[PDB]
C-alpha cells in the first residue's frame, strides 16, 4: 500500500504505537512490552525509540510512505517518535497533540495520599 496514519499513545506506563490506514484500519503496531521492556522501563524515551522502529518495519512490509502522527496522552515518547520515524525514512506530515480533553466529564479518582 501507499498511505496511512500513525497513532501514538504515550501514557505514564506505555508507549503504544499503531500504524493504521488514513480511514482507520490497522497495519502494524508495537510497544515496550512488545519488545521486552518488562518493568517500569516502558515510559523511557529509549523504549519509544525502539518500539516505533519495529512497527515501522511492518510499514516497509506494506510499502506505505506517508504518515500523519497523532500524539495522545502525557508521557515522554512524543519526541521519540519524531526522532525515530523521521529517521525511519517515512514521511511525517502532520503532528497533532490530540489528547481527549474532557470538558468536565466524570469525576477523577482520589489523590494518592488521602
Amino acid at each position: 500500500i501507499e498511505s496511512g496514519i500513525a497513532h501514538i499513545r504515550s501514557t505514564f506506563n506505555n508507549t503504544i504505537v499503531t500504524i493504521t490506514d488514513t480511514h482507520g484500519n490497522a497495519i502494524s503496531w508495537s510497544s515496550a512490552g512488545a519488545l521486552g521492556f518488562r518493568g517500569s522501563r516502558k515510559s523511557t524515551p529509549f523504549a519509544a525509540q525502539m518500539a516505533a522502529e519495529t512497527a515501522a518495519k511492518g510499514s516497509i512490509e506494506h510499502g506505505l510512505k506517508t504518515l500523519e502522527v497523532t500524539v495522545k496522552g502525557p508521557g515522554s515518547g512524543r519526541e521519540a517518535a519524531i526522532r525515530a520515524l523521521q529517521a525511519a525514512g517515512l514521511e511525517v506530515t502532520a503532528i497533532r497533540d490530540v489528547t481527549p480533553v474532557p470538558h468536565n466529564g466524570c469525576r477523577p479518582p482520589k489523590r494518592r495520599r488521602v
Binding site: 521492556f37 522501563r41 523511557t44 529509549f46
Partner: protein, 149 residues
C-alpha cells in the same frame, strides 16, 4: 575539592613505553618493583618467542579486546536498583584493562605468573579468553541498562 591528578614515571628499559610501567605498578604486592619486574621481562621474552612477533604489537592489541566502552553507575530509588550508562574516559580504558588483566592472570593457575600472564595476553590477543568476557558481560550489563542515560 575539585579535580586532583597524580604523577607517573615515563620510561621503560625494554618496550620503551609509558603504559607498561603502569603495569609494573600493577602486581606490586607489598612494595616490590623488581620482584614484579622479574616476572615481567621473563614473560615477554616468552611472548616474543612462543608467538613469533614483537611483544608490543601483541600487548596493546590484546588490550583492545579488554578496554571497555561503557561503565555502569547506579541509582537507588526505594529499592528499584537503577543503573546509569557511563562513558568510559580515555583515562579509564588504560586503568581498568590492567585490573582485568592481572586479577584474572594470577587467578588462572599454572606454574609461575611468567606463564600465567603470557598465555593470558594470547587469550586476549586471540580474544578467546576468560578475562575478555569480563569486558563482554559489562556490555551485556550495558545493553540491558541502555534505556536510561
Amino acid at each position: 575539592k575539585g579535580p586532583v591528578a597524580k604523577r607517573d614515571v615515563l620510561p621503560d628499559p625494554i618496550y620503551n613505553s609509558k603504559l607498561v610501567s603502569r603495569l609494573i605498578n600493577k602486581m606490586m604486592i607489598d612494595g616490590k618493583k623488581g620482584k614484579s619486574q622479574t616476572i615481567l621481562y621473563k614473560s615477554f621474552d616468552i611472548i616474543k618467542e612462543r608467538t613469533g612477533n614483537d611483544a608490543m604489537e601483541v600487548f596493546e592489541q590484546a588490550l583492545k579486546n579488554i578496554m571497555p566502552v561503557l561503565e555502569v553507575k547506579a541509582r537507588r530509588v526505594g529499592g528499584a536498583n537503577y543503573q546509569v550508562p557511563v562513558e568510559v574516559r580515555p583515562e579509564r580504558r588504560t586503568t581498568l584493562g590492567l585490573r582485568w588483566l592481572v586479577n584474572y592472570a594470577r587467578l588462572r593457575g599454572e606454574k609461575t605468573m611468567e606463564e600465567r600472564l603470557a598465555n593470558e595476553i594470547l587469550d586476549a590477543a586471540n580474544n578467546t579468553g576468560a578475562a575478555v568476557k569480563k569486558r563482554e558481560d559489562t556490555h551485556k550489563m550495558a545493553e540491558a541498562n541502555k534505556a536510561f542515560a
